């Protein structure tokens with residue numbers, strides 16, 4: 001559960017909640033009202049409340065006085081299990097999550113919605129066990145379920161800040177009620193079991209109507225849709241044990257940003273590790289970090305082994321005076337050996353938004369192993385935020401796609417930035433969605449947060465901010481308009 005996240009509270013309301021409803025060790029996280037894009041961790045310690053800032057410019061979550069993380073749920077899981085890690089220099093403990101009662105970011109909550117439109121939505125998109133919770137219709141709520149086929153409506157009374165379906169147990173929140181009737185299904189007198197199988201889909205849209213949905217999300221709606229996706233990240237806390245191994249620690253750009261064990265690229269004492277994951281839609285990708293001096297050779301073993309023929313670099317080598325990805329390729333016309341691997345930089349070609357490097361990769365002492373690797377280096381992504389126009393990114397991705405398509409039996413496309421999750425996730429999700437539209441045509445169903453959630457189950461925190469989220473919609477909108 002991610003109930004420690006309160007999406008609609010101020011710092012004063014947070015301080016009040018922790019002082020009146022929490023104890024020492026109580027904590028919650030919330031979006032920043034003063035800096036819309038950032039987050040705050042409010043913790044109760046020795047009768048007082050601290051407000052620790054969490055910054056996210058697009059590459060990772062950076063906790064002031066703590067570490068860098070891929071998601072807020074990964075950050076919380078870490079600090080709840082490892083005490084003393086968070087700190088004037090005094091240790092701050094995350095012991096008791098202070099739960100949010102607000103139903104706003106739950107997949108099934110529709111707020112203002114009529115019984116007519118709820119039936120409309122459930123008749124179209126719904127299936128057996130599909131449900132939603134909406135406002136009544138007054139000050140009360142309604143649970144609407146599809147079974148079979150038919151739609152049943154169950155009134156939810158709100159009496160003295162508690163919720164009930166007219167008898168039995170009274171719940172502190174709509175969530176506790178929903179979870180309770182998910183496990184203990186309501187039974188109609190004639191035997192109809194009101195099973196709450198899955199929430200109703202509100203995000204899947206026909207590609208041709210992207211303009212109408214984007215116009216509706218710009219009224220913001222994007223923030224709410226993104227936060228509903230963010231709440232689902234508690235389901236993706238898969239093991240990341242291989243990256244924790246002593247011998248693997250310094251092969252990670254960031255100690256607490258790790259590849260999932262079940263999707264990590266295994267390299268064939270400890271020579272099998274790289275911070276990289278295979279990304280498979282529903283063309284494959286390898287989402288990886290920018291190289292470290294001690295991982296350059298592992299990077300080339302990975303490219304060779306996977307039969308990758310295209311590399312997408314989404315950052316400049318240096319941004320804001322800091323190394324984003326070390327130079328792992330030779331100078332134009334040069335030949336270098338990186339362990340057992342040999343690389344020639346054949347030719348460099350400059351475009352407006354990017355540089356192309358034609359590289360030849362082979363294994364030392366085995367001439368017949370040579371293959372060309374095309375490195376597409378995107379150089380115009382801004383220092384902060386996302387591009388103001390998606391044209392550049394789209395034209396680049398179109399070129400990468402055509403290169404990948406021209407090569408028989410080419411392995412996955414390697415995509416890398418700094419931590420390999422923000423910009424990397426954005427380029428990959430755009431490429432995936434735009435690939436749907438190439439095959440199926442403008443007559444296809446697209447579901448942006450479902451695509452994101454699918455990529456996130458393969459590598460932690462793929463697509464980091466709401467700005468990237470909106471950029472993905474803008475890029476999909478631009479591509480369809482140019483069709």
Ligand SMILES: O=C(O)c1ccc(O)c(-c2nnc3n(Cc4ccccc4Cl)c(=O)c4ccccc4n23)c1
Nearest residue numbers: 077078079081237238239240241244255256257258
């Ligand atoms: O053993 C399993 O089957 C299993 C299943 C699910 C999992 O989420 C994990 C697991 N994988 N990584 C983690 N981290 C991160 C961590 C620990 C050490 C150093 C750096 C980093 Cl960044 C946790 O803090 C963590 C905390 C509690 C419980 C599981 C955790 N966990 C393992």
